[PDB]
């Protein structure tokens, strides 16, 4: 799990949201009368009504993610 | 789990939200009469009604994340 | 878990929120009559009605996160 | 768990919130008639109605976080 | 758990909040008729109705956090 | 748990809060008829109705925090 | 315009209304840049969201109404 | 305009209203830049969200109404 | 305009209103830059959110109303 | 305008109102830059949020009302 | 304008109001830069948030009202 | 204007009001830069937050009211 980023040197961004009665649930877990469960999140969960990503990367960007599940 | 970032050197950002009766639940866990459960979050959970990410990276950016689950 | 950041050298940001009756729950855990549970958060949980991230990184930025779960 | 940051050298930020009856719960735990539970937070939990992060990093920034859970 | 920061050398920030009947709960724990529980916070919990972070890092910044849970 | 910071050398910040009937609870613990519980806080808990952090770091800043929980 | 009523002698009434955001306008008159207008009401105007009339007349009932408009 | 009523001799009434944000306007008149207008009410104007009339007349009832408009 | 009423001799009434943000306007008149207007009310104007009339007349009841408008 | 009433001889009334932020306007008149206007009320104006009339007439009741408007 | 009433001979009334921030205006008149206006009230204006009239008439009741407007 | 009343012979009344921040205006007149106005009240103006009239008339009751307006 190695991440690196380097940068060497030698407009209008409009988001308009007009909603009404917005109900958002990003990560939900409902367990009833069960025995064993695992909710494993290790990446990126984005939830919205107006989910906007403008000009996310304009330089050095590097996201390193890893998940592990071992059950011996 | 190594993260590195270096930078060597030698506009209008508008978000408009006009909502009404907004209910947001980012991370929720509901356990009733169960035995064993694991809610493991190790990444990035973003929840909103107007979730906007403008000009997130313009330089050296590097996010290193890792999760581990061992059950012997 | 090593994080590093170095920087060597040799506009209008508007967010407008006009809501009414906003109910927000970031991290919630509901346990009733259960036996064993683990709520493990080790990353980044962002919850809002108007969740805006403008110009987050413009220099040296590096977030290193790690989670571990061992059950022998 | 090592974090480092160094910087060597040789606008309008508006947030407008006009809400009414805002109820916020950042981190909540509800335990009724259970036996064992663990609420482990070791990262970053942000909760709001108008959660704005403007110009978070413009220099040397590095957040190192780690969590550990061992049950032998 | 080592944190370091060094800096060597050789605008308008407006937040406007106009709310009414705001109820905020940052960290809450409700235990009724249970046996064992642990609420462990070791990172950063931010809760608000208008949670604004403007120009957080402009120099040397490095936050090192770690949590440990051992149950033999 | 080592923290270091050094700095060697050789605007308008407005927050406006106009609320009414604001109830804030930062850290609360409710224990009824339980046996054992631990509320361990060792990081940073920020709670407010208008929680604003403007120009937090502009020099050498480094916060080192650590928590330990051992139950043999 | 003569009304008369005489009476000589020798259960469950349930109304259930569960609405949300109800806007009612019984008698409205909108005049803009006009010359002459007449709004003459002399009968019976009933306006509602749940307009219920149960067991209105069980005895002597007699409603006598009259309207007149003369323009010589 | 004569009204008379005589009476010679020789249960559960439930109304349930559960609303939210109810706006009621019984008699309204809007005049802008006009010359002449007449709003004449002489009968019975009933306006509501839950307008219930239960067992209005069980005896001698007689409503005599009259309106007149003369313009010579 | 003669009204008469004579009477010669020889349960549960429940109203339940549970509202929120109720705005009521019974009789309103808006005049702007006009010349002549007449608002004549001579009957019965009833305005409400929960307008209930239970068992209004059980005996001798007689309402005599009259309006007159002469413009020579 | 003659009213007469004679009477010769030889339960639970529950009203429940639970509101919040109730604004009531019975009789309102708005005049701006006009010349002539007349607001004539001579009947019965009832305005409320929970306007209840239970068992209004059980005996001799007679309301005689009259209005007059002469403009020669 | 004659009113007469004669009577010759030979329970639980509950009103429950639980409000919050109640603003009531019975009779209001707003005059700005006008010339002539008349607000004539001669009947019965009832304004409230919980306007209840229980068992108003059980005997001899007779209300005689009259209004007059002459403009020669 | 004659009123007469004669009577010849040969329970629990509960009102419960629990309000908060109640503003009441019975009769109001606002005059600004006008010329002529008349506010004539000759009937009955009732204004309240909990306006209750229980058992108003159980005997001889007769209210005689009259208003006059002459402008030659």
Swiss-Prot record, chains A, B, C, D, E, F, G, H, I, J, K, L:
Changing residue 28 to T: In PARK1; no effect on osmotic stress-induced phosphorylation; increases oligomerization. The modification Phosphoserine is found at residue 62. The keyword Acetylation applies. Phosphorylated, predominantly on serine residues. Phosphorylation by CK1 appears to occur on residues distinct from the residue phosphorylated by other kinases. Hallmark lesions of neurodegenerative synucleinopathies contain alpha-synuclein that is modified by nitration of tyrosine residues and possibly by dityrosine cross-linking to generated stable oligomers. Sequence repeats lie at residues 17-31, 32-42. GO terms for biological process: adult locomotory behavior; amyloid fibril formation; behavioral response to cocaine; cellular response to copper ion; cellular response to epinephrine stimulus; cellular response to fibroblast growth factor stimulus; cellular response to oxidative stress; chemical synaptic transmission. It is linked to Genetic alterations of SNCA resulting in aberrant polymerization into fibrils, are associated with several neurodegenerative diseases (synucleinopathies). SNCA fibrillar aggregates represent the major non A-beta component of Alzheimer disease amyloid plaque, and a major component of Lewy body inclusions. They are also found within Lewy body (LB)-like intraneuronal inclusions, glial inclusions and axonal spheroids in neurodegeneration with brain iron accumulation type 1. Parkinson disease 1, autosomal dominant: A complex neurodegenerative disorder characterized by bradykinesia, resting tremor, muscular rigidity and postural instability. Additional features are characteristic postural abnormalities, dysautonomia, dystonic cramps, and dementia. The pathology of Parkinson disease involves the loss of dopaminergic neurons in the substantia nigra and the presence of Lewy bodies (intraneuronal accumulations of aggregated proteins), in surviving neurons in various areas of the brain. The 'non A-beta component of Alzheimer disease amyloid plaque' domain (NAC domain) is involved in fibrils formation. The middle hydrophobic region forms the core of the filaments. The C-terminus may regulate aggregation and determine the diameter of the filaments. Neuronal protein that plays several roles in synaptic activity such as regulation of synaptic vesicle trafficking and subsequent neurotransmitter release. Participates as a monomer in synaptic vesicle exocytosis by enhancing vesicle priming, fusion and dilation of exocytotic fusion pores. Mechanistically, acts by increasing local Ca(2+) release from microdomains which is essential for the enhancement of ATP-induced exocytosis. This is Alpha-synuclein. The chain holds residues 15 to 97 of 140 of the full protein.
